[PDB]
Design an enzyme around this catalytic site. Structure first.
Site, PDB file in Angstrom:
ATOM      1  N   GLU A  76       0.848  -1.190   0.000  1.00 52.28           N
ATOM      2  CA  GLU A  76       0.000   0.000   0.000  1.00 52.28           C
ATOM      3  C   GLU A  76       0.883   1.239   0.000  1.00 52.28           C
ATOM      4  OE1 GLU A  76      -2.730   0.339   3.250  1.00 52.28           O
ATOM      5  OE2 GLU A  76      -3.260   2.406   2.749  1.00 52.28           O
ATOM      6  N   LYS A 109      -2.225  -2.238  -3.103  1.00 51.56           N
ATOM      7  CA  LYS A 109      -3.300  -1.455  -2.499  1.00 51.56           C
ATOM      8  C   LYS A 109      -2.991   0.021  -2.697  1.00 51.56           C
ATOM      9  CE  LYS A 109      -5.990  -1.128   1.769  1.00 51.56           C
ATOM     10  NZ  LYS A 109      -5.798  -1.191   3.244  1.00 51.56           N
ATOM     11  N   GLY A 131      -9.654   5.801   0.628  1.00 53.60           N
ATOM     12  CA  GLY A 131      -8.936   7.061   0.637  1.00 53.60           C
ATOM     13  C   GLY A 131      -9.808   8.279   0.858  1.00 53.60           C
ATOM     14  N   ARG A 170     -13.388   2.414   5.155  1.00 53.55           N
ATOM     15  CA  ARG A 170     -14.578   3.214   5.411  1.00 53.55           C
ATOM     16  C   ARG A 170     -15.662   3.010   4.363  1.00 53.55           C
ATOM     17  NH1 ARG A 170     -16.124   7.387   6.156  1.00 53.55           N
ATOM     18  NH2 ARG A 170     -16.640   7.897   8.328  1.00 53.55           N
TER      19      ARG A 170
END
Lengths: 343, 343, 343, 343
Positions: A186, A228, A271, A302
């Site tokens: 990531e 990622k 993000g 999220r």
């Protein structure tokens, strides 16, 4: 000369795990929130941050009904979540496996400042990472997460920050592969500032090229890895508006210019975009006319849990409601991963 | 920040040229040979090396009949070949365009030794390359060739040699793209020594990763570039035997681990293998079960011209015979590029 | 492993030449100027740019009286100046040797733009540089000059430009050392813009560190090399004033942080400062309390020739006047190199 | 642009500490040994490894009489040694300060394998290194030691290992400088194998160049750092004999080619040579005719403690004898650092 970092059996195991994580129609549920990271999310409701509350929230995320099974191919857990159990006593990794998912663990120990840089940070967590990864492997974790944080500023990201993040990601990948754990790389680029889509794409290309050069330098088996990256999007302060098609075009173009096809799949992160926006952008990315040799799945923290948290409200009465909301969002994200999400 | 090396029109032109070069069923005829390079080839017959002999040989290669048109998508020419004419007065670049091919030029000025290395060399030719590339563009050349020579030894290729070749290839690509010419990146690895398939694959992966990192560092538009790598093959002194399927698997694996999909196509070079062996290996590469995001075409110097030279014999009587032999080899290599070459 | 780029005899010859160039009290007369570069200088007077005028000007620079001998340890010549003769018929290199100086040649072929950068350039001239350097060695040139141009902007110098200039300087140094010619590395940083002394020092440190890393990577014998860096000075548009002591402290600090002591000497360039200012800054640098392990000499193009050109006026009547002016400036610069220049 | 990693006050403090550590005639006592590292040394006598035994041994090393004060400028301690007290209750850091020395701490957490390398290792210990360094600073530790292990093999050290060790050393230096602790950079090269003096010098030059390039990239204040490199010596299996003068010349040449003069001092490590041999080699290094801009002191673990341990014998009766032996060896090493050691 050529010293094999991984035997063919290790490479086969890593490839199998990686392909299981990003199998078609399946993505990643990023429940890798620390005690302080999930504290802010639980404060959005007003529910106190306790061990039992965290356990019940992660049980709600992980013990969803059967229709979420072919949509979630992996679940990233925090260190404490890997050792909690469901209401029926089943450990959370066993709950994930019983649903066909792949157990993941966040192995990075947070970001630390880089001296001489404009607020740039590098990620720590390489101390004893071999023993930690081996223990996670014995505890059911088949892949790992490492969040390297990069931002876009007037002189940022610098060469030092990009090289540092690529090097640390490569070391983490090497350790994870040596321990039989698929490393999810990531190199997240923060969507903070007024930078537009073009600059985000340029920075993403530079960061991904450096990351994959570092992975090559560290003899990383790319078939046993997943990426990622941040969705290539304009900054939150950017006034210019970009359609979902433009964002998808920029993201796929940045991936095709830097990511080698050997990477099993690209699992995007939310993000800071809304749940619906993240799902729509993923669907547009998977609908991009450019040829995409990797499984473009989702690894959303999220974007899979925001409305589930809002519906739960911290009380047991909305357990089923939050299960339903998380399930519907996971189905939407799976459809986006398959390219047929039609809101 | 992000300073665009190429405008969208320049990027579109480069992408169009690159896609034309490696269009399905089309490959590259590497007819580029210096006066001394083709001197050895013409000495295998006994025919003296003259301007007229070179002109007639390149006319024989370039004035093939209609069956070569859908098989040759590009022709790499030497500097003097770009300015010669056919028997009917048609310039060689115009002959190539009239057949639907794309005119190419060898812009590198040979290899020079690298001090402190075990016989390793770097390629020169960057002096005035902008003016030369612009002149070639006005003269019909739409892509360029740059041969960077690497070998495999007990301590070779070193970090210095790999980094040097990647840097020079990136500078060549930058200049060519600025001049509207598609750069064909050739980080050729010599099949000299007893190194096996595994070591050749490892070295090819390292070289290609460094090459593409250098291309990213130089802001190279990869969609406007083509790759001309060595087939991943065992050394000529290697006793262990590898099947065509193993060679194809190793080559495709090395390409997928390093080459980004943005590259329009990978045009393999013969690298000292026979015509039939090169065609069979290309067919196996295009038949590899691994997903191949690029056009895996051929850019063959001797694998398309050895039998044509042998049939020609330096005399005008075998013009038709040598033309037919070259045509049949071009058809075979096109079939290999499409993956249906069945000898 | 360790392949010696230079034999001990070659290393001894290079060290001897380098120490002769920067022997105590001796500096470098940078008389190298292209036909168009010296054209602007001669246009400041009104004298036409001809071969004879250039020859007489370089004879005036080179045939100064005896007291300039222990002040000039090297003279950098253009390609055409190396093959001109004085009024008595003695070749210019022989005139330089007869005065105890070391003959130098500018081997770089100018700067070329770097694509994707904010006006940044890289230097060309590596094509056939081995043959050119060998010919220069047979013609009396014992050291070479290579001007790599860097500037300071809001995003400049970038990583690409710094790495490119360091790589090209290292390649030029390798070629020159292989040909028995001492390479003078010039990673010149333009004093253009409003950047202050601190930013100039930071950029100089970064550039010199990258340059010397590239020199190490190319196996450059640093004892057979000299450095020609920009004086660490504020930009010409910088409003903040810095004393000569501050400039000297910044320059010596930048050199001590990046330049290894193996370098025989650091020969500063004028970089657009006045003759008196350049001499005073060199004297302050040599008077800096910091320990300086290298010979901090001068390699001044216009800081040695501005007053000589003004006095000459393009007519033969002021030959002696321009000789005397250049001689007094060379004496001042030699005193500055020795640290006892008191205007 | 230029973001100051350290304020001028921080730079002044680091420079003062570094100059205090390597003040003329003063060296470093490397007393940092883990529980298992000192276990082997205590087993050579026959004395069991306990907390009290370790405390008494380090008290014997640290409570030497007045003749050690002008000879030892720094003492590197283990984590547990920093928190032990002498017989009179004085903490070991306070005992070191009362003798005029500078308290040091080993902050690295050992070496870990690098995948894909021929037994090469990288050093860990960067997790929470900021908090650890701050705590050490509050506990009296003014400098830190980080041992990066490199060896010489047929294909070793590789580019990956050298770059990794340089990067980790640079990160360690950045963290230590941010916490006010002088970082001692140790890119130790193991004298294992049959490699000769020339290859050791070549590898040392490559390693030190990469290390200092990494330090520059991480904005390391080199005046606030010290270097702890291996003495350039032939391998233990090398059949060819080299005199002390040859070893000194090779070591000084390797240092002058890579280490910038801004480094406050170079504190050599024993690296498995005998006490007398280490002292003689240090004396020869300080007597080398080459100009040495740094304080070439000693940081010896076994070369200061071997005879002290042998004389001690694990029993309290030989406390004075072992203290005297350590004192005489410290005096010898101080004389070697001053260049007037005459056995």
């Amino acid at each position: 000369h050529s010293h094999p970092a991984l035997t063919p059996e290790q490479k086969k195991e890593l490839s199998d795990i990686a392909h299981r994580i990003v199998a078609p129609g399946k993505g990643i549920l990023a429940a890798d929130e620390s005690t302080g990271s999930i504290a802010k999310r639980l404060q959005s409701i007003g529910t106190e941050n306790t061990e039992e509350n965290r356990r019940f929230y992660r049980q709600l995320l992980l013990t969803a009904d059967d229709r979420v099974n072919p949509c979630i191919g992996g679940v990233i857990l925090f260190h404490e979540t890997l050792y909690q159990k469901a209401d029926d006593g089943r450990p959370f990794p066993q709950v994930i496996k019983s649903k066909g998912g792949v157990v993941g663990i966040k192995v990075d120990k947070g970001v630390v400042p880089l001296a001489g840089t404009n607020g740039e940070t590098t990620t720590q967590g390489l101390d004893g990472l071999s023993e930690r990864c081996a223990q996670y492997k014995k505890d059911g974790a088949d892949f790992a997460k490492w969040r390297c944080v990069l931002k876009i500023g007037e002189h940022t990201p610098s060469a030092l920050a990009i090289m540092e993040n690529a090097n640390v990601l490569a070391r983490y990948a090497s350790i994870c592969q040596q321990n039989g754990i698929v490393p999810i790389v990531e190199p997240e680029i923060l969507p903070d500032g007024d930078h537009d889509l073009k600059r985000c794409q340029y920075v993403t290309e530079k960061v991904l090229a450096a990351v994959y050069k570092a992975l090559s330098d560290h003899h990383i088996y790319l078939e046993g890895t997943l990426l990622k990256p941040n969705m290539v999007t304009p900054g939150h302060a950017c006034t210019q508006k970009y359609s979902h098609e433009e964002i998808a075009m920029a993201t796929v173009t940045a991936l095709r210019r830097t990511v080698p096809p050997a990477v099993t799949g690209v699992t995007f992160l939310s993000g800071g975009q809304s749940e619906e926006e993240a799902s729509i952008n993923l669907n547009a990315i998977n609908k991009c006319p450019l040829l995409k040799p990797w499984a473009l799945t989702f690894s959303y923290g999220r974007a899979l849990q925001a409305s589930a948290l809002k519906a739960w409200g911290g009380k047991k009465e909305n357990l089923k409601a939050a299960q339903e909301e998380y399930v519907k969002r996971a189905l939407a994200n799976s459809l986006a991963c398959q390219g047929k999400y039609t809101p």
